[PDB]
Amino acid sequence: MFDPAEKYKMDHRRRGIALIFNHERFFWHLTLPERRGTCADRDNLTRRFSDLGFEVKCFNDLKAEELLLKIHEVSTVSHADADCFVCVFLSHGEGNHIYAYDAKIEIQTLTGLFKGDKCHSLVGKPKIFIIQAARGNQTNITEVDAASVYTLPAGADFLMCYSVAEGYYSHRETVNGSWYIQDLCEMLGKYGSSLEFTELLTLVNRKVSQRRVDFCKDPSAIGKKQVPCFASMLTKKLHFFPKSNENLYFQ
Template identity: 65%
Template sequence: MLDSRWGRAGSVTGRRAKHGTGVPLCAVMSSSELPPAGHVQVDSRPALSSTDGNQNITEVDALDIRQTLDPALQYKMNHERRGVALVFNHERFFWKLKLPDRRGTFADRSNLERSLTDLGFEVRLFDDLRAGDVEQKLTEACKDDHSNADCFVCVFLSHGKDDHIYAFDEAIQIEAITDMFKGDRCPSLAGKPKIFIIQACRGDKHDDAILVHDAIDSRDESSVNETEVDAAGIYTLPAGADFLMCYSVAQGYYSHRDTLNGSWYIQDLCETLRKHGSSLEFTELLTVVNRKVSYRRVDRCRDISAIGKKQIPCFASMLTKKLYFYPKSK
């Protein structure tokens, strides 16, 4: 029996998402209206080339502070294996949902497979699954024995709306997914990091560009920035420790994807993982990713109103310790 939050008729997800009502306003267009290759679509992928445009971003070199930290302040990451990473990739959707194909999502899929494998994860890839099949794969992972694993990762590449993510045929409540990996249902992951990465739209607004001074910000400029961050509140938080929720965009806003090279967020996340994944504390790494994505802007798009718009990712950490992905000994 499926959890009521998995979008069945009469369920909590009965915002009639699967019949088109409540469908995110994310650039819904017919196949004949799709932009030419290389254009940026709403909820599109980031390009691997030109991650920072012309911006000269100085990344803080990772300091090896592992030897100075109390081991009790760090998650134990020297188990026999790194753990499982599930990647649910959705390019096409049931026609009644009236959702556009997510061209370029396979670039994200490949990027994540490479980056997560390099970190030592056992990567399991799934494409265009129905909601029931998504639940089955999650249930199998929940029932796995993770005793000899460091952590767990789950990634969704899809369209989204507020606290829901779309499978092929209907929307799934994100909380229904995270609940499956709480300590009472997955005891072998209790006390271990559980990382969820959501690449999807989270609303129907674009983020306008503002002028920011790197040196000394005025009080007015600072308040503008803080207001944007406050408005980026996470709609759904899992009630439990050791969860880390990573979102490609702030609550209520569009996420952008390049039709050739993938979403901005996944592109910059994977690039930063390759450079600093084994040395930088993970929430610090996510902050670097936030900065890199924030320097991007839409240059080409069929939707003229999207030109010049920006994007800022966000994450909500319920981690209780520092998280380092130390290299695994061969």
């Protein structure tokens, strides 16, 4: 009884949690620049993930110890009554690391906490990570960073989403926020509730790839294109259709 149109079960009581780790400033001795505009990203994401039924939980400028505690907490709580799990990083990164305030964390140890083995309540449910992280280079200016974070997959039923691929550049407007987040959040607003999520991420790839970078206020920023990507280990179609909440306890 094999079904080419099989969808993840998205009929649980609650949609699930969306973590957002949001990083604007860094410990002096890391020599990483302010990510001015990351609060636009955090707020835009918070709105769009809320409207899809997520319990959004934001954390600003956590040290490694605090971050590991919050994400481990969330991994060991029960997700039994939840459709899925979303985790977002807005920071600097390098290779297989994201920056917390004070030090780098191995991405594999964060995604590892939600792998079948370690988090039973999320087995066979989609686990989406969205990563807006690049190399800190050193009114509304556009800053540009070199891609730095390996666009790795995680495990079965994960979807890893990346602002930028190897050899491209990642853009953040200091008031409007990151190109990738703006375009992801626009697409979530228009199509979040109708389109399959990889269909949508493909729209985000088109939108971001088509941002022209020929006439730029900085000369050295010209020719630096942005192409995002996603690594899918999903096994079914993923939809965020409106949940029917009429005369039901959903908290």
